[PDB]
Amino acid sequence: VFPGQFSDSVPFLKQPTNLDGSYVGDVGFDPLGFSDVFDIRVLREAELKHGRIAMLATLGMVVQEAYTFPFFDKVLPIPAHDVIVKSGGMSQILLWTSFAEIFGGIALFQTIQGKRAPGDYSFDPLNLSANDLEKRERYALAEIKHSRLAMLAFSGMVHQYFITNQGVIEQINNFRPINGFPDATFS
Amino acid sequence: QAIPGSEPPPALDGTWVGDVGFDPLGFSRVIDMRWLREAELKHGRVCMLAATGMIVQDIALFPGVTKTFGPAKITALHDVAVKQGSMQQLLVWLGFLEIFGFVAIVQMLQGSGRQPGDFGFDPLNCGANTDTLARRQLVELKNGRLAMIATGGMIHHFFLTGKGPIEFITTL
Amino acid sequence: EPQGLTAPIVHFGSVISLWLLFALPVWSAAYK
Ligand SMILES: CC1=C(C#C/C(C)=C/C=C/C(C)=C/C=C/C=C(C)/C=C/C=C(C)/C=C/C2=C(C)CCCC2(C)C)C(C)(C)C[C@H](O)C1
Ligand SMILES: CC1=C(C#C/C(C)=C/C=C/C(C)=C/C=C/C=C(C)/C=C/C=C(C)/C=C/C2=C(C)CCCC2(C)C)C(C)(C)C[C@H](O)C1
């Protein structure tokens, strides 16, 4: 309300020092100043890695309840974590993702040197936005928005299962309030 | 000019809303003025909402809330709602908002440019023009102080009598 | 049932240890 320069997202906080706006998805939202303590490139790579993992996590949390493979067994994903820990396949997932992150770490260390864009592994086999440059930043904005939405969504689904003990598809069709609150007294 | 015998602290020299020179103990001598005014507006707004909410609660309740919370109001309502999880949700989300409030206070104290109590929350462009904004600032401050005293009064009235605001004032 | 290095407990412990071992230099450099 009072005159002064502030961030586009939060109107009572100023624009952060290291959020100039060159990176996609930047609405000037850094209240605690994480970009002032650590580099924006490392933070962007961490954000993209978390967001992509969360995208695949939300897709899995939907599909595993929607359709389970003929092998393994029909079980909810959260205890399926323990089931596949005891089965041995999750250790192999860990090994292969570690093998990918071995090269990912070298990519990150070259990102600090400023030789590659943060989160840019140059993986476009379908050339969906490789030849065209105007589509590239639009797809980057879409990817980062989907990344944040997927992180929020996976956290929501997990914490809904933790108190509801129902599947995500089960909860949107058999919606029950927690703790027996429909007919609860002195809660 | 509030108290003719005494004098205001040198931090109280006008150019502030509600400055009638009333600070005999000298809080502005050791505390920054921006922090003091931000805290004054925060207490005032919290007590405004609390007093209006207490009046509404003692007048009319939500559907289905009496089935769970029973005939408990004010402090018994708090004691039941902490177990219910309503006040836990309030604490979580209001502390989440107070994170941004905290960094707003920090940027104000280090010189971003914002004024104490200014969170930019002005829907419908109400009172954003001319001297109406300053009049609304004075009204907000005075009504916040009045609501602060009234909130304390209602809390202590329920402490003494065990009755709500609208029923204590009608059953003296 | 597996024990020692073949157990998955040591596997996730090892990945956490590598996470900290790589958390030192990458965040030290992001700080610098
Ligand atoms: C800011 C803003 C807005 C806004 C807004 C809002 C939400 C403004 C809200 C203002 C509020 C809630 C003011 C409350 C005042 C309460 C007082 C003075 C105390 C009452 C209690 C008393 C008198 C107790 C009396 C008592 C009783 C009963 C019995 C015991 C005795 C005693 C204790 C004395 C919008 C939405 C308009 C938009 C705008 O763009 C931005
Ligand atoms: C603890 C507890 C709870 C609680 C609680 C709560 C909310 C307790 C709150 C207590 C409060 C707010 C007390 C404040 C009273 C106001 C005073 C003393 C000042 C009045 C103004 C004056 C005298 C002005 C004087 C004046 C001045 C200076 C200027 C002009 C002259 C004059 C007018 C004389 C719960 C609800 C959580 C439940 C829990 O289980 C137990």
Question: Resolution to 1 decimal, in Å?
Answer: 2.5
In a 3-state reduction of DSSP, which class is residue B32? Answer: coil
Which ligand lies nearest to the CA atom of residue B41 in the structure?
1
In a 3-state reduction of DSSP, which class is residue A76? Answer: coil
Chain A CB within 8 Å of residue B107 CB: yes
CA distances from B58 to B72, B154, B158, B163 (A): 11, 11, 12, 9
Chain A residues lying within 8 Å of B120, measured CB to CB: 1, 6, 10-12
CA B107 – ligand 2 centroid, Å: 31
In a 3-state reduction of DSSP, which class is residue C17? Answer: helix
Q: Do chains B and C touch (3 or more CB pairs under 8 A)?
A: no
> Cα separation of A4 and C14, whole Å?
51
With an 8 Å Cβ cutoff, are A91 and C8 in contact? yes
Q: Do chains B and A touch (3 or more CB pairs under 8 A)?
A: yes
Q: Which of B49, B92, B6, B106 is nearest to A13 (CA)?
A: B106
> Cα separation of A94 and A148, whole Å?
24
With an 8 Å Cβ cutoff, are B80 and A10 in contact? no
Residue A119 region by backbone torsions, left for phi larger than 0, else alpha for psi between -120 and 50, else beta: left
How was this structure determined? It was done by cryo-EM
Chain A CB within 8 Å of residue C12 CB: yes
Specify whether the CB–CB gap between A9 and A28 falls below 8 A: yes
